[PDB]
Amino acid sequence: ARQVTIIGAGLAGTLVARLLARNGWQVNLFERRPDPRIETGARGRSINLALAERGAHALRLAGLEREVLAEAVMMRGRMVHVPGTPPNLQPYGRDDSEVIWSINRDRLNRILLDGAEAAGASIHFNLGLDSVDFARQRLTLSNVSGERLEKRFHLLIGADGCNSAVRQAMASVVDLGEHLETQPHGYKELQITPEASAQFNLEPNALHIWPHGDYMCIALPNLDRSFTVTLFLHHQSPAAQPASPSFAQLVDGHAARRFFQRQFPDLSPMLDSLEQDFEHHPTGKLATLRLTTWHVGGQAVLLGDAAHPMVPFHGQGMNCALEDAVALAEHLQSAADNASALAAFTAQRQPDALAIQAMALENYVEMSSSPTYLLERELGQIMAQRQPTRFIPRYSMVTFSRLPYAQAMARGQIQEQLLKFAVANHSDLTSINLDAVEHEVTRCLPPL
Numbered sequence: 461a462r463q464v465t466i467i468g469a470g471l472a473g474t475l476v477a478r479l480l481a482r483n484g485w486q487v488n489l490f491e492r493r494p495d496p497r498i499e500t501g502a503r504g505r506s507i508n509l510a511l512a513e514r515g516a517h518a519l520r521l522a523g524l525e526r527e528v529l530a531e532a533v534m535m536r537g538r539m540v541h542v543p544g545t546p547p548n549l550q551p552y553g554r555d556d557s558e559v560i561w562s563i564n565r566d567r568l569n570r571i572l573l574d575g576a577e578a579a580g581a582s583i584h585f586n587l588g589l590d591s592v593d594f595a596r597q598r599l600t601l602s603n604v605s606g607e608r609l610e611k612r613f614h615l616l617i618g619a620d621g622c623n624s625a626v627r628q629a630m631a632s633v634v635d636l637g638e639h640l641e642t643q644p645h646g647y648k649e650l651q652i653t654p655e656a657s658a659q660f661n662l663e664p665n666a667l668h669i670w671p672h673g674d675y676m677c678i679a680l681p682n683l684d685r686s687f688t689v690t691l692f693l694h695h696q697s698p699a700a701q702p703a704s705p706s707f708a709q710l711v712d713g714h715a716a717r718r719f720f721q722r723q724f725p726d727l728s729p730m731l732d733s734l735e736q737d738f739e740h741h742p743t744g745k746l747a748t749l750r751l752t753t754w755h756v757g758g759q760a761v762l763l764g765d766a767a768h769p770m771v772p773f774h775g776q777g778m779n780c781a782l783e784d785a786v787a788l789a790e791h792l793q794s795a796a797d798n799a800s801a802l803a804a805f806t807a808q809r810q811p812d813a814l815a816i817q818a819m820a821l822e823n824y825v826e827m828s829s830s831p832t833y834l835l836e837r838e839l840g841q842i843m844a845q846r847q848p849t850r851f852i853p854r855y856s857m858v859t860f861s862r863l864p865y866a867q868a869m870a871r872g873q874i875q876e877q878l879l880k881f882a883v884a885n886h887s888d889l890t891s892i893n894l895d896a897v898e899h900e901v902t903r904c905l906p907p908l
């Protein structure tokens with residue numbers, strides 16, 4: 461039986477562990493944190509993620525989709541909140557088959573851990589990877605107390621997240637050709653209780669957005685009608701705009717309250733614990749990290765956040781990581797040898813990871829910001845109605861299909877250009893020759 465050591469029992473790590481273990485691989489998974497399935501008296505906080513077709517399909521292949529979806533809230537559309545207009549629901553798709561699912565990350569991770577163990581993988585918690593000796597094929601792990609443990613390895617999978625220790629160890633034997641693009645927005649998680657969301661009639665079956673240009677809030681629902689609100693705001697005010705809001709200007713929870721009362725007045729009354737959440741929850745950091753190299757011969761490979769940290773503005777990081785896990789298990793299972801598997805996996809996934817990284821950055825302006833754009837959306841709807849197998853909005857291709865991200869991006873760009881061109885020099889849709897735009901659609905977009 462082929463052997464594999466996986467670092468990180470997160471989303472990608474535990475999925476790849478199940479896929480490989482059920483194919484008869486001897487799987488050992490090392491995780492720095494304690495086992496979250498071991499109930500303690502610690503007061504844990506709920507963070508939700510948007511699960512879309514890519515992630516759901518990866519879970520479906522693993523035989524875990526039903527179990528995960530039983531614990532997920534359906535999000536039928538986007539609810540945009542702008543003061544002075546009632547909340548506007550933008551349905552995500554044609555019907556309830558085109559939805560996104562809000563899932564608690566901890567619940568998802570527990571289901572995944574059970575799945576990897578049921579398949580035969582062994583999971584070792586409270587052991588963080590410290591270093592790797594590639595030449596000797598040994599690695600060093602330690603608990604929180606710094607007590608060390610050395611292990612021999614045959615194949616090493618770095619599923620250890622955005623601050624990957626495997627990636628850091630690889631960067632000592634190979635030049636990974638890493639390019640870090642820092643992101644100016646920090647984030648803070650705030651809570652809306654079930655009583656508050658019910659009192660203010662906040663729709664449970666939708667993804668909620670409070671756009672505000674350079675900053676914004678998003679809320680995802682929980683099974684119990686509570687919501688996790690995420691504020692995206694610059695860490696610091698720029699040199700050009702010193703008065704512009706930033707985390708540096710919000711000295712404490714009381715400053716955060718005044719800021720919400722002024723900038724998010726319809727949201728502030730729903731945030732009962734705003735002050736407390738602001739001071740006790742740390743401000744998170746965002747970034748995009750692109751690597752030229754994801755593997756060291758047949759010895760080690762990266763996937764998920766370890767390979768391609770991305771900004772969260774498209775809610776695709778977990779979706780992409782689960783898609784990566786399927787691809788990596790498929791390549792490893794069927795390749796001539798591990799070195800061939802790792803090279804084929806990297807060649808396949810690298811263009812798609814770059815595409816979602818670019819699309820995630822672009823989605824921010826789409827969410828947080830129109831005149832000509834409403835005419836573009838109107839024309840886009842008609843083109844999707846006339847040619848549903850050719851004109852598929854980029855958001856739908858990314859969220860509701862398994863089309864390679866690079867293909868969704870390339871087709872999205874053709875669509876964006878046709879719409880921009882068609883509406884230019886036109887006041888309304890009546891002056892636009894719909895058949896001529898349709899002719900460009902049939903000419904430039906092959907049916908799917």
Ligand SMILES: Cc1cc2nc3c(=O)[nH]c(=O)nc-3n(C[C@H](O)[C@H](O)[C@H](O)COP(=O)(O)OP(=O)(O)OC[C@H]3O[C@@H](n4cnc5c(N)ncnc54)[C@H](O)[C@@H]3O)c2cc1C
Nearest residue numbers: 468470471472492510589621625764765775776777778779
């Ligand atoms: C604010 C925010 C919102 C997001 N929202 C969404 C969303 O709506 N939808 C979506 O698709 N994605 C979303 N994402 C992205 C998503 O959370 C990640 O892309 C995803 O968790 C990556 O999965 P992973 O398995 O690669 O890494 P992780 O889930 O981070 O798992 C890494 C694991 O490795 C462990 N580990 C780390 N270092 C070591 C070490 N040295 N030794 C051993 N173990 C170690 C960690 O403890 C952890 O268990 C969001 C991200 C952020 C920051």
Ligand SMILES: O=C(O)CCn1c(=O)oc2cc(OC3CC3)c(Cl)cc21
Nearest residue numbers: 469470491493494495496565566569
């Ligand atoms: O911010 C937080 O409270 C932690 C979020 N989180 C994370 O970054 O990696 C995780 C890994 C987890 O379980 C796997 C088995 C270790 C869980 Cl249950 C949660 C997380």
Ligand SMILES: O=C(O)CCn1c(=O)oc2cc(OC3CC3)c(Cl)cc21
Nearest residue numbers: 510538678680690772773774775827
């Ligand atoms: O364009 C849209 O209508 C929404 C895009 N999107 C998504 O599908 O899941 C998400 C999760 C997000 O962050 C998590 C909640 C903290 C963000 Cl910031 C954006 C998305």
Ligand SMILES: O=C(O)CCn1c(=O)oc2cc(OC3CC3)c(Cl)cc21
Nearest residue numbers: 878879881882891892893896897900
């Ligand atoms: O509305 C009309 O009467 C103009 C029709 N029209 C045209 O003659 O050439 C086009 C080319 C177009 O896009 C491709 C990217 C150049 C579009 Cl979107 C529209 C047209």
Ligand SMILES: [Cl-]
Nearest residue numbers: 772775776777
């Ligand atoms: Cl994301």
